[PDB]
Symmetry: D3
Subunit: 306 residues, 6 copies
């Protein structure tokens, strides 16, 4: 009845992230593609069963939603909110549609992106394209294991999927994306122990620092948030490394899924604006966000029903 | 909760299909084998975990049911209905038991089949034995990706498993088998574009032709059927290639699972007898059915407790 | 609702079994460690996604429970009961905590064990440590496939997890461990046929001997038990081989999970004390138990909510 | 500098053996296929780099040689010699061309066999086609590890490749094929220890029996032959299991390569005709030859030069 | 003389880096060249045995004169621009080539990062391409690409400098060209028409017969026979690359040869044509946007530098 | 040409090191086993083709050589020379035979060791048995990638095989073994930067430290040796981690192969006794040798010919 898209699925060794804007007069072409995206994913993906693990998660931005559909909107859908901190800024950049494409091989991702874009040619303008790759033992460009504390099982379901709070849109999710570029030269000037105090975990072994030693402005400290009832508010991250050596571009493509954007936005506010105990997240002293967009990823049957 | 046999499990790289008839006075031997087939599957399969993926699905034909069992019969169980179209015919051939054996390796299939047939020696007569193999990127002998639109998840369960409409047999399914031989000489004389018009999908990329270009007598058009309620009727297919180059035998072994045989039967009727828009399915111009049988595959517990 | 530990997960190619006692005054250090074991499991295991398959099952013994926790006790928790047969004895040995660590590679097991033992230094005393390895096609040191008749799916859940009969501890299980050393010299003086009569299955093919020829004092005969309800009583076994060639140590590390210890204890009594028709299990003529301990493995959330 | 065909390559998981005779008028078609066979092998094989390991060895029989080529003949090429022993017979059957096709997957073998036979349609009559498969840990249908004592490295080159003794044909080899069908019922009536005596090695562990225990009519004893120079005479065997359970067809497809047919013929004589100390090879009491043919497999460059 | 890894096969990932040496950057580059093999080992050893990381370093003609004082490789000269009537092969700056391959992109990226870290401020990047395997060794035109590469001793003879230039024995010459394809134009051809452009069957990769193969097909024009009569061969490690948003669908051409004359002869035939052919038809769908020639010295040459 | 044992082959994921002494009177049994060790290796190893990678290198100590054999001895065969430094000592411990067993899986190593020791029972006394395992990305227990600068190709052959300097023993090698235990508590007290100064390489990335920063008492500095004629003296190391968590045993099993013990001894003297610039190798401040033995590993044909 409420079949979600593959928002709960694990990290893979390859990804493509595509973000586009819909041109004036391109809505009908988009709606037609949306109704077919599941068929296209199967068309390509079936060629590589059992090990291909191809998926595509399609998201739709707030303004786009109003152009495409009449009737109810998801309760939490709004444009990404720019955060202008005293030192660091989280920019909002244009994006109407997100395609988060994952597989165990880049070819599958590329083949599917080709089919999607082929259908949208002349109706959309590309805003961003990133080809992500796994880096060693699930490391990011800063050299730390990245994704460790993601929720799993029932916990992930509860953290990520819209439920009875917005019944018309149950099985959907909200995705926030941000493309970060790192200052690798600066970061490499820190000792490993200083890097560990920025993140909040040991570098090689990935063991969390004890509470008596973890700084209040470490990344793990600032992105740990408790809800009304003492429980952790969780998001599901599918961050991937990307880059270009000749351009000195060493990045993290951030994508986080959550059942309400309020959770992800709380984490961002703490990072960028800081708290009474932390000026800002120290990870931002080595990381610049160059995109920022929010999407709603509907249940799969919503897109079919078109 | 009734425990199904492995009728929902995916395609594998190797398969053995075995169809036998039960000789007069063979019933007791067969019943004792039926009660042991799961333990035989584990005895062989356990040797190859975790990657062996050995399974065996056992089906029983309509006439055999009546020789083996007193009491309730599955509601949809009848002999395969011969279809004598104007040009093409779907023959009915004898078969009392089906063993649908799958694994990631042929040795495991062969070892299990050996143990089964050793127990049935003198009680059964073999009618058909086919050793199927994966062909490139999930292709069939016509060079097309085959299996793409199979249901998955909840949809597959709904489509395949008997439920409350026949509660004594909940968790069962119906399998139809047909062995097809292809005229490869004739097929390979067609252009790719002509072959695509026969199937209804692009050959290399496996993308479905749009509705405005897809012929009414293409295979995909004829095997797409909407139910009374406008709901699509679905089957689960585990087709495998087979052949012998020296005898010019290039085959598709068709096996389709469904909650009721009426669904599969409607598809065959459309293919063999045609519609208002189509004389018959053009695939049949290059494919000849040489067997045809219908089996019920009971819930696993049913076999266990007999 | 309650999340079990990974007690239902399959065999892997590597394991570490670590049994320790809690030293006088070690209680608080152990409680802090128990609250963090899942975190540690993730810290190490995430590095090896997706194929590492690291898990850790943590068990607590009867005496230790009382030292660590106030309030309710699991209903079936008691010290391992020594069985002093006429010929063979099942010894009870000290053990307060069990860590059953599994992965597809030993390095992941060793890394996690290192992190747990580093946190427990000064608070526990090691009692046994075994590094298990897969031996050919899931064989044990006697040369027989080992694990074949383990329950799977729903039958496993039913057989292993505590439910509404003890609702405060639902999602838990009971583990019994015994380290066995084999007399391989004596074993290898037996013909294959004689070995088959000891075990109750064919050696190469792992097919069960038929009821006609299966000895009453065979291993499989004695460990096949039914309730007064008539159903099979099942346990889940994760036995691993281990050894040292220079010391002539050829071993089977037995670990069996069950929803109540009574099931496993019944099997042990049949083995060591025999039945009307069998003096004891013949496997014990070639196998000596040198440890014996019983643990409760709580639901995951019990440990966390510490 | 002559380039051999892939006669020194290892065993693979899948094989196809194809034997055909050349029809009246078929010689030109055959010579054109021979000139292209390496190019066909690449055409198919490159699709599955790095792991497909596709190869084709092409052999030519004695009578066919003379129909296809003028000028010199290989020194040792003659028709297979039938051996009519007092109990068992090594039969000779027709065969002009051999294709020995190997890969890690059957699809590659089948695709190459399809391209080959497509070229040859109307010029050849198929005599035999077998699809071989790996059986557990390099076992044959008798349950023994099969291939152990094959030569490797320098020793294999010396044993298999024609050298200065026949310089115009240096880089070639001689292949003897025999299809054997086994009496599995008779074989399984022997204890394992009796089977071990027949073969001359331990069944499970593959360790050779000591000289003190090994019978003179054991298979290993009879196929161990020393030359006049005290030199061990060696062949390279690529035999594969095959079968059909319904037909009770459990087979060994024997293929042995050697630098001269006299080595292989000596072994056959010892097996079928026996020695002073053994009437015949006991393996033949459970194994019946139903084909026998001898081929020369030229250097790769010889075929290309056509 | 130890060659660099120019004979090694295709891998699933590659990075191609081309840089120019800034005025005054010569000493830094010499230093790096002396260390490139130690960097390769430093990264590569981490992923033994399946990483397959390699780096081949090439030096252009102008750079050679700037870096070294002694003799020049006899064939070393700037890439020769070809201005054909319709199509042009452009010559673009490039002093150093790093051709980095592995089974995973992370290893490629890590090594590139270390190389470029050492060169920062001494070199200017000219081109960086991240190549990926596309299905069954296909290129962006949908054809299997690499089939007729030489192997074994033929590859060695075709690719490595020998006695004809003894001071440079073990070296090779690499030509690179980055090509972008007009996929829209290409996809408007029938498959049959595309086959006539290439000269091989699309799906099966079988060469067209010499009757059917057009004179202006790519295979016909790149098939070159020397005075001798024997085929002139090169070794190609072409990789796909692209960007879907930018409509960039590319083939990164790299071809290795013992003398540049061979590759240059093929280029002349393609762009300038022959008696029979105005130009290679593949160029109607393919534009070269880079063109550079490099000498890749023996490994000992680079190790022995100041 | 003498055929070496597998002394040049790469590191594997699993290893067993077995060191025994020969009891008085066990010489004949030992000689018989030495003549069979290659047959035993094949017997087990063939079961796991193609990926088992099982090998066994057999070494003989100086005192043992003189008990087993008569006639000429290898020129550099002597007992391990104890090194009594001011601070650190390298002990000499008994060992007459070494079996260095490697495979991709421990079961294969264990099965072969079982067969070898089965044959030697009652003739030998075990002295050491270590079961080594790969640790992450080729790391040792100190957390550094270990094996990076091993020689490969021709350089490896030159460094490790006896040649014309001792022609009767050409194709042999010398192995030195030392079992090291590490003081992990002390090591973990160092910053990563301080550990890098002890080793001489970067910890995560395995890049060698610059010659300006690399300390003179770093491990890499002291084990880098040039000969009188300017050549680098190299050894081939197949070190493996081992340990036991409950005993707080974290080790490195050192094994180095070289064509003369003089190279390995020179390295050891520099480490333990120091140089004009370094008191001793800083690695020894965290590593204690607990065994030390020297073996000659003869050419394979020497063993076979006994
Ligand atoms: C510059 C970009 C980023 C990098 C390189 C990065 C890296 C990391 C690393 C290494 C960890 C620790 C291991 C783990 O549990 O994944 C972590 C944890 C986490 N990150 Fe980030 N991160 C980035 C941006 C973000 C952003 C933008 C958010 C939220 C809006 C976020 C939310 C989190 C959360 C919730 C955790 C888990 C904290 C916990 O409960 O322990 N991260 N990240
Ligand atoms: C010496 C230690 C042991 C060895 C080497 C061993 C070996 C085996 C083998 C080879 C089988 C047959 C294949 C399979 O179903 O797993 C088996 C079955 C079994 N074993 Fe054991 N076992 C040992 C100890 C135990 C112990 C201590 C128990 C219980 C307390 C146990 C309970 C079982 C059960 C329940 C079965 C399945 C019987 C059936 O239902 O068919 N085993 N074991
Ligand atoms: C757009 C750029 C190119 C593409 C997509 C391309 C594609 C192909 C394909 C599909 C084949 C047939 C299969 C094979 O043998 O690899 C082929 C063959 C070949 N190509 Fe190209 N190629 C390109 C550029 C070049 C260039 C620039 C050269 C030489 C300077 C070249 C030399 C060859 C050679 C020598 C063969 C083998 C011909 C034979 O002996 O059958 N290619 N290429
Ligand atoms: C105590 C335990 C030992 C440890 C943990 C260890 C560890 C290491 C490490 C991490 C490296 C750097 C990476 C590489 O392998 O190239 C290295 C290099 C080396 N080690 Fe050791 N080692 C040990 C003992 C020894 C011994 C006893 C010797 C010689 C007798 C030795 C000889 C070498 C050599 C020759 C190199 C390469 C130096 C170079 O040319 O860069 N090691 N070792």
């Amino acid at each position: 009845e409420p079949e979600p898209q593959m928002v709960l699925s694990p990290l893979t060794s390859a990804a493509i992230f595509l973000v586009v804007t819909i041109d004036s007069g391109g809505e009908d072409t988009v709606r037609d593609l949306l109704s077919d995206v599941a068929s296209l994913e199967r068309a390509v993906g079936f060629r590589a069963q059992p090990d291909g693990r191809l998926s595509c998660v399609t998201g739709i931005g707030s303004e786009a939603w109003d152009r495409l559909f009449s009737g109810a909107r998801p309760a939490g859908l709004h444009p990404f909110r720019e955060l202008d901190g005293p030192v660091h800024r989280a920019v909002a950049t244009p994006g109407d549609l997100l395609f988060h494409i994952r597989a165990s091989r880049l070819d599958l991702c590329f083949a599917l992106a080709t089919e999607i874009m082929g259908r949208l040619r002349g109706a959309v303008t590309p805003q961003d394209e990133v080809h992500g790759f796994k880096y060693f033992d699930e490391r990011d460009m800063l050299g730390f294991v990245d994704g460790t504390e993601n929720p799993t099982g029932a916990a992930a379901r509860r953290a990520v999927l819209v439920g009875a709070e917005d019944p018309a849109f149950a099985g959907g999710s909200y995705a926030v994306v941000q493309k970060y570029l790192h200052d690798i030269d600066a970061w490499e000037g820190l000792s490993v122990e200083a890097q560990e105090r920025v993140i909040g975990r040991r570098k090689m072994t990935d063991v969390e620092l004890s509470d008596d030693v973890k700084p209040a402005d470490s990344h793990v400290a600032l992105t740990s948030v408790t809800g009304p009832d003492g429980s952790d508010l969780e998001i599901l991250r599918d961050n991937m490394p990307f880059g270009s050596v000749g351009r000195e571009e060493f990045g993290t493509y951030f994508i986080g899924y959550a059942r309400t954007p309020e959770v992800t936005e709380t984490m961002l506010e703490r990072m960028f604006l800081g708290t009474a105990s932390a000026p800002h997240d120290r990870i931002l002293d080595f990381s610049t966000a160059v995109t920022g967009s929010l999407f709603f990823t509907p249940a799969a049957d919503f897109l079919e029903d078109l």
